[PDB]
Amino acid sequence: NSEVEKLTKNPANWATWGGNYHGTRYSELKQINTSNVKNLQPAWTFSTGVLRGHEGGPLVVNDVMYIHTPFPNTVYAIDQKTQAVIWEYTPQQDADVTIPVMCCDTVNRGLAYGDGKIFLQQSDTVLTALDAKTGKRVWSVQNGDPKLGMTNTQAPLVVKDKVITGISGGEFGVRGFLAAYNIRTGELDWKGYSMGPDADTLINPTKTTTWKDGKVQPVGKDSSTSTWEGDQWKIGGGTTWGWYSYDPELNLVYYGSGNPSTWNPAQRPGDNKWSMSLWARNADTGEVKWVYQMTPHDEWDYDGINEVALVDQEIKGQMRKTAVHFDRNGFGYTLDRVTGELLVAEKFDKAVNWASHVDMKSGRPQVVSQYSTEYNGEDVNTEGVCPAALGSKNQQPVSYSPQTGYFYISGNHVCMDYEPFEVEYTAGQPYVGATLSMFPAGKDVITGKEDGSNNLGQFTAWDATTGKIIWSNKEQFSVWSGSLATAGGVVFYGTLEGYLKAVDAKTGKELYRFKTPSGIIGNVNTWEYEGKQYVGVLSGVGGWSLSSYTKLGGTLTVFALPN
Ligand SMILES: O=C(O)c1cc(C(=O)O)c2c(n1)C(=O)C(=O)c1cc(C(=O)O)[nH]c1-2
Ligand SMILES: [La+3]
Numbered sequence: 001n002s003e004v005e006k007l008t009k010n011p012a013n014w015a016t017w018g019g020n021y022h023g024t025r026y027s028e029l030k031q032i033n034t035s036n037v038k039n040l041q042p043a044w045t046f047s048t049g050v051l052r053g054h055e056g057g058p059l060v061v062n063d064v065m066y067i068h069t070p071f072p073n074t075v076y077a078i079d080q081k082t083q084a085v086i087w088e089y090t091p092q093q094d095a096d097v098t099i100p101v102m103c104c105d106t107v108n109r110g111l112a113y114g115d116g117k118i119f120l121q122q123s124d125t126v127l128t129a130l131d132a133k134t135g136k137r138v139w140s141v142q143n144g145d146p147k148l149g150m151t152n153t154q155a156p157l158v159v160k161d162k163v164i165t166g167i168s169g170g171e172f173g174v175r176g177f178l179a180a181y182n183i184r185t186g187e188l189d190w191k192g193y194s195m196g197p198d199a200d201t202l203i204n205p206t207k208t209t210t211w212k213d214g215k216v217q218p219v220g221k222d223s224s225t226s227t228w229e230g231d232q233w234k235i236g237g238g239t240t241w242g243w244y245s246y247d248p249e250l251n252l253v254y255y256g257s258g259n260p261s262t263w264n265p266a267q268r269p270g271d272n273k274w275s276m277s278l279w280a281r282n283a284d285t286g287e288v289k290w291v292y293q294m295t296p297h298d299e300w301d302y303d304g305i306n307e308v309a310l311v312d313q314e315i316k317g318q319m320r321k322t323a324v325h326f327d328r329n330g331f332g333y334t335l336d337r338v339t340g341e342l343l344v345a346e347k348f349d350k351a352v353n354w355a356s357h358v359d360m361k362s363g364r365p366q367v368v369s370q371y372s373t374e375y376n377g378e379d380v381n382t383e384g385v386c387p388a389a390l391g392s393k394n395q396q397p398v399s400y401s402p403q404t405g406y407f408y409i410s411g412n413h414v415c416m417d418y419e420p421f422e423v424e425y426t427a428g429q430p431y432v433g434a435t436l437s438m439f440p441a442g443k444d445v446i447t448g449k450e451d452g453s454n455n456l457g458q459f460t461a462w463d464a465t466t467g468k469i470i471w472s473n474k475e476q477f478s479v480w481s482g483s484l485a486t487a488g489g490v491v492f493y494g495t496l497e498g499y500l501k502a503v504d505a506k507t508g509k510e511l512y513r514f515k516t517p518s519g520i521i522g523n524v525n526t527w528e529y530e531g532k533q534y535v536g537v538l539s540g541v542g543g544w545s546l547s548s549y550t551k552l553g554g555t556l557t558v559f560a561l562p563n
């Protein structure tokens with residue numbers, strides 16, 4: 001959408017979930033910098049009036065602040081002059097049908113803006129367009145069916161004249177899709193499934209490519225169903241509950257697909273394509289430009305849905321248009337975002353042990369049999385797999401600084417025992433089939449050696465041109481918030497104890513901290529109002545001893561330098 005694109009070029013706004021379409025969560029604002037961020041203070045606060053996890057972050061457009069909540073997903077438009085609500089919208093949702101099928105708290109990743117409207121993807125899968133000035137509903141469409149186990153937790157994305165939204169339900173046998181709705185009417189324009197025949201997936205057998213035998217090659221016929229046994233793909237997962245990015249020059253939307261449904265791999269032989277994959281789709285038609293499967297035949301629920309950040313960077317002496325993705329499976333991937341060529345794939349937490357490496361010719365991770373839950377078998381405990389199913393990074397999106405050339409990862413440092421067992425599908429019921437327990441990785445993030453630690457989180461700086469950790473800071477709990485990098489040389493993020501922290505973008509040294517009321521699982525965003533830069537974050541623990549550090553919450557804290 002060229003209007004949204006124009007809005008994102010004004011640093012005073014934060015007009016999409018990721019600040020810009022490329023998803024780098026980097027702000028050119030530099031009023032707050034390494035010299036003065038120690039002088040930051042809370043400026044004002046706002047309770048959302050709702051409890052449970054507060055993911056996502058504020059969306060600021062032309063001085064109006066828009067904030068969202070977990071179920072029932074009330075939306076507020078806030079006037080920064082009076083710090084009062086301009087309008088609010090609370091959808092009517094059936095709690096008894098929607099809550100039981102939410103796998104991982106009642107969270108909502110946030111809003112989109114476009115064509116004078118705010119777009120809210122509701123938990124019950126109703127996608128609703130609101131007038132941005134009045135908050136009155138313009139249109140809405142039921143994007144899924146919670147009676148089949150479908151929910152929505154992710155943020156929509158405005159792209160050209162469409163609103164892009166996905167689906168959740170990889171633990172309920174939902175077949176994942178990405179859908180595009182007309183921005184003005186809500187009519188469905190295209191729908192791209194993650195698996196099934198080409199008319200469903202919008203894969204072109206001679207034009208859609210993948211990485212194979214060391215080169216970009218057409219995907220061929222029956223690329224998906226030939227990797228599934230029989231009809232298992234009809235309930236086969238690959239859901240789409242992560243973040244979406246967009247390259248306007250290429251007109252490509254990028255995203256990841258989740259786990260292949262049941263957590264018992266022996267029950268579903270085959271690569272299970274295209275679960276656990278990265279995708280580039282034509283924004284106008286949905287046609288897949290390229291797809292890359294990171295985790296064939298998943299055995300651990302390492303959902304491939306984490307964001308795909310788009311950056312131009314030098315690799316082997318040449319400027320490349322890349323896509324960078326820090327997967328649940330603990331590998332940080334760099335691809336050519338035009339062709340889908342695989343460039344870099346290295347572990348961003350050296351505790352990771354389920355695979356030795358990613359084979360660069362075949363593109364497939366080489367599974368280490370001791371940590372294979374299928375190898376050890378049904379009803380046998382696989383012990384000490386790293387990472388835990390919740391991954392080395394979960395939903396919390398990364399930031400990128402062009403000043404340093406580093407990505408900043410809000411990381412998990414958690415391993416697990418995992419025991420699969422055979423399960424049967426019933427629509428509306430869970431379709432899992434594994435028993436897990438988790439514990440601290442207990443190994444150094446950089447060397448991989450046992451270290452006597454018990455930290456559950458890492459905050460890690462990563463060079464995606466070589467695939468190397470630059471520095472990493474231990475955090476006592478997993479880091480579940482989306483960071484922010486700025487032209488002031490600082491990186492912001494939130495902790496589960498509720499601290500908003502600022503660190504030096506180059507070195508990782510801490511420069512500021514403040515205890516907000518509840519653990520932060522949202523995104524730290526920044527904007528400018530009447531010439532002053534503000535930094536905003538939601539607090540409210542949820543998603544996924546911590547309970548002695550934080551209780552449930554739901555507040556916004558806005559920080560600024562004092563006057
Ligand atoms: O397979 C799915 O469809 C689906 C959805 C979600 C979701 O919608 O929040 C999560 C997961 N899977 C998942 O595996 C996971 O670890 C997870 C963590 C969280 C969270 O917000 O903290 N959501 C989800
Ligand atoms: La999942």
Ligand code: NA
Pocket residue numbers: 198203204205219220221222223224
């Ligand atoms: Na195909």
